[PDB]
């Protein structure tokens, strides 16, 4: 074909309205929305729904999530919070496999010893059925 | 004078080898093969 099949080269771009997850500091594990850009390495974020106060944070401590929503440039806390509810980014993040894995690991860390024994018994029961299915096809 | 590691002399020797030089060795080996086969045929 004559079309330019050249790869699209998809990239997670940092932009106004992008929602990111903080991986360090007191606000670790909380979502924040980028409001404005300070420089090539520093950005302004606001996560009032997540409870993180507005502050300037280096991109080194921030990882960009695939989710994005429209935010006017320089939007204050009230506007950012309103757009957060309008876009329902929290529900989309929860439905994402990343949040599912985070919640799964968090629950695993808190599992009780009796809960651990129950998990082992359930895993054995599931394995029994799974191996019964195998060799029968 | 030119040494063994002289590129021009080595190239000339290689060209000579591709010339009748290698054909002579090929003919010698072909002749030797006949006697090698005769050693078993006898």
């Amino acid at each position: 074909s004559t079309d330019s099949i050249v790869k699209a080269s998809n990239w997670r771009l940092v932009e106004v309205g992008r929602v990111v997850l903080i991986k360090k500091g007191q606000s670790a594990g909380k979502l924040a929305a980028i409001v404005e850009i300070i420089d090539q390495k520093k950005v302004l974020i606001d996560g009032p729904k997540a409870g993180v106060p507005r502050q300037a944070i280096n991109l080194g401590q921030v990882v960009l999530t695939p989710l994005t929503f429209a935010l006017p440039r320089g939007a204050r806390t009230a506007t950012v919070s309103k757009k957060w509810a309008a876009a329902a980014v929290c529900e989309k993040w929860a439905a994402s496999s990343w949040a599912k894995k985070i919640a799964q690991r968090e629950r695993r860390a808190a599992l009780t010893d009796f809960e651990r024994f129950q998990v082992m018994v359930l895993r054995k029961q599931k394995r029994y059925t799974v191996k019964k299915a195998l060799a029968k096809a | 004078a030119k040494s063994l590691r002289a590129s021009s002399h080595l190239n000339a020797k290689s060209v000579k080898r591709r010339g009748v030089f290698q054909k002579a060795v090929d003919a010698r080996e072909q002749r030797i093969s006949d006697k090698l086969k005769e050693d078993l045929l006898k």
């Binding site: 799964q104 695993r108 799974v130 | -």
Partner: protein, 197 residues
């Protein structure tokens, strides 16, 4: 945690990999390095060749035989680099070095064993984009290594065999995953999901 750790030398840095392996050996963790011929060193090829030639120029004037030994194989180059960071002259250093094995390519039985990498020593992660680098195999060949062609054929054969093995394993894992997904939605599956599994 594993009794023996296999590290793939391809794409790694000589200095960082040697330092981490030396530190691990001193702690008692046995380590074996494979595919050392694919190891990389920072800087362009000419600088590494110049440094290797300068090192080779060192010899004992009155008796060349007993002077420094300039090993040409990539594995021995890595071994010398690691030994430079280890007090091999002591009994503890000798014991630590006995836990280390270095090979070019992946000879058996290591070809059948899992291979790991050191994130803090990867060339890609550490070296800035655009920075030039030199391959240990090319340097070894330029400095007298003659087994470069022999290793390539064995590496290709091992790659083909492992590709067939993975062709089998991918189908097996796909079948296992399909069976597990079919088993999903069961009471045991729901309980495991609610319990984090």
């Amino acid at each position: 945690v594993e009794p023996v750790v296999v590290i793939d030398g391809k794409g790694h840095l000589v200095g960082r990999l040697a330092s981490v392996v030396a530190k691990q050996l001193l702690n008692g963790q046995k380590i074996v390095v494979v595919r050392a011929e694919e190891l990389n060193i920072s800087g362009e090829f000419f600088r590494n060749k110049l440094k290797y030639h300068d090192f080779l120029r060192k010899a004992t004037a009155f008796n060349k035989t007993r002077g420094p030994f300039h090993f040409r194989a990539p594995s021995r180059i890595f071994y010398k680099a690691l030994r430079g960071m280890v007090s091999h002259k002591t009994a503890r250093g000798k014991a630590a070095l006995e836990r280390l094995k270095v090979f070019e390519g992946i000879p058996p039985p290591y070809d059948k064993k899992k291979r790991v990498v050191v994130p803090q020593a990867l060339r890609v992660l550490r070296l800035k984009p655009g920075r030039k680098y030199t391959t240990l195999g090319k340097l070894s060949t330029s400095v007298g290594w003659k087994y470069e062609d022999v290793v390539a054929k064995l590496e290709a054969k091992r790659k083909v065999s492992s590709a067939e093995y993975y062709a089998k394993k991918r189908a097996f894992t796909k079948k296992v995953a399909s069976a597990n997904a079919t088993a999903a939605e069961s009471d045991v599956a729901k309980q495991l999901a609610a319990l984090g599994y």
